[PDB]
Copies of this chain bind each other. A is one copy, B any other.
Amino acid sequence: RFLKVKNWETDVVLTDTLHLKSTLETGCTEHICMGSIMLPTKDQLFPLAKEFLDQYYSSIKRFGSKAHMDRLEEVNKEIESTSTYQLKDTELIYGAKHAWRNASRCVGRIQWSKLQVFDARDCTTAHGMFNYICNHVKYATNKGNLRSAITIFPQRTDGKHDFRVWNSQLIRYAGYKQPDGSTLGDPANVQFTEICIQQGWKAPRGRFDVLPLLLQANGNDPELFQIPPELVLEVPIRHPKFDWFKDLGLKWYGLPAVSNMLLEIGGLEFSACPFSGWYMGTEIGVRDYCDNSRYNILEEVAKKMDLDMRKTSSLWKDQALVEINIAVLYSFQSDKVTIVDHHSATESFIKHMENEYRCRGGCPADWVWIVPPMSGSITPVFHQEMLNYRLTPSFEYQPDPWNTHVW
């Protein structure tokens, strides 16, 4: 019931108790581990509300005060009457910061307490949503000095008036299937790109076309909006040694901003809650650029480097991978757009785990996601035992809106 995690490089052992608070289920059982699977009423609501308010009042050292008891009663009376309740601003801020704190797949959580929370619960239309979003993009971008932020649209009601951003990230590139059978642009976004087109977007049909936003307010049909180009900070990718690299014509955007997740606080569900931070270099260089199902540029780069591509054992893929990632980091740094390398990010996360173990009694972490997609064992997280469990408030996956929406 009290669990130990060991770091095998430093021998440091931590004891975890925080997991006993866990309420949600993992997918695993005593007989089978599913650690590597990507996706494993009035009655229901009051316990969820009480669990949340208890931790909130505990966090401000007011557990069991009249202010605590009164709030419990007020929310209780509100659920009984309205079948829902509203969070105070202070609770909403706390809940959003803790959903990040609890995100077991996030290596950047040393930052969790510095999150700017934009309350967009007064929003009613897609144009209103667009305005909030552009304001978020501009705030977070901060001319390259990126700042973490979340914008929180109205909470789920009867479920037929959902607010949704249809985009998977606020800023992402289009993918087009070609007459050839090849793919132009980002193949991850082919389907959404076609949804935009069929909704009415005039696609440039290039390699790096910023997708328009598709915004759904109040369960209404979603509407298209172009993000002002001036708000989309982009980085041309060059190499500090290889002159020819810039002629690959690579670029990426500076602001990573997830927009398809669901934020759960105190049993209330926020289906539109776009949040942003900044990139770890490997996300672009290893995953966006080198995944076979993504821009898949390893072949073209290795050719420019004149490496022996005859045999896998020459490690030509590995050599080309390192250079692509050097270029990504060099380009962002040269343009003064915030980025973190995997060495620095993982070192930070280890320090964060140690803070959380002493200040909180644990830190849920999903090793499969936390270890970087290159150079695993030369980062300290590789050698760190981690316990994965689900705490609330949380960010959760939700079905893509096009399978769900009734037009």
Q: Which residues of A pack against B, CB within 8 Å?
A: 3, 5-6, 8-9, 19, 22, 25-38, 281, 286-287, 290-293, 298, 312-315, 317-319, 321-322, 325-326, 329, 333, 341, 343-344, 366-368, 371-378, 382-389
Q: Are the CB atoms of A377 and B286 closer together than 8 Å?
A: yes
Given A3-B32, A33-B28, A368-B368, the answer on whether A343 and B322 have CB atoms closer than 8 Å is no
List the B residue with the shortest CB-CB distance to A308. B240
Q: Are the CB atoms of B375 and A317 closer together than 8 Å?
A: yes
Q: Are the CB atoms of B374 and A375 closer together than 8 Å?
A: yes
Report how far A28 CA is from B40 CA in the complex, Å. 14
In the complex, which of the residues B313, B318, B325, B368 contacts A35, with contact meaning CB atoms closer than 8 Å?
B368
List the B residue with the shortest CB-CB distance to A285. B315
Interface-centre pick from A8, A29, A383 (highest chain B CB count, 10 A): A29
Report how far A287 CA is from B367 CA in the complex, Å. 18
Report how far A319 CA is from B287 CA in the complex, Å. 18
Q: In the assembled complex, which residues on chain B have CB atoms less than 8 Å from the CB atom of A291?
A: 9, 377, 383
Q: In the assembled complex, which residues on chain B have CB atoms less than 8 Å from the CB atom of A382?
A: 373
Q: Are the CB atoms of A315 and B326 closer together than 8 Å?
A: yes
Q: Are the CB atoms of A32 and B371 closer together than 8 Å?
A: no
List the B residue with the shortest CB-CB distance to A39. B6
Mind listing 8 A-B residue pairs with CB under 8 Å? A8-B293, A35-B36, A37-B387, A313-B333, A315-B322, A373-B378, A374-B375, A374-B378
Q: Are the CB atoms of B373 and A9 closer together than 8 Å?
A: no
Q: Are the CB atoms of B36 and A385 closer together than 8 Å?
A: yes
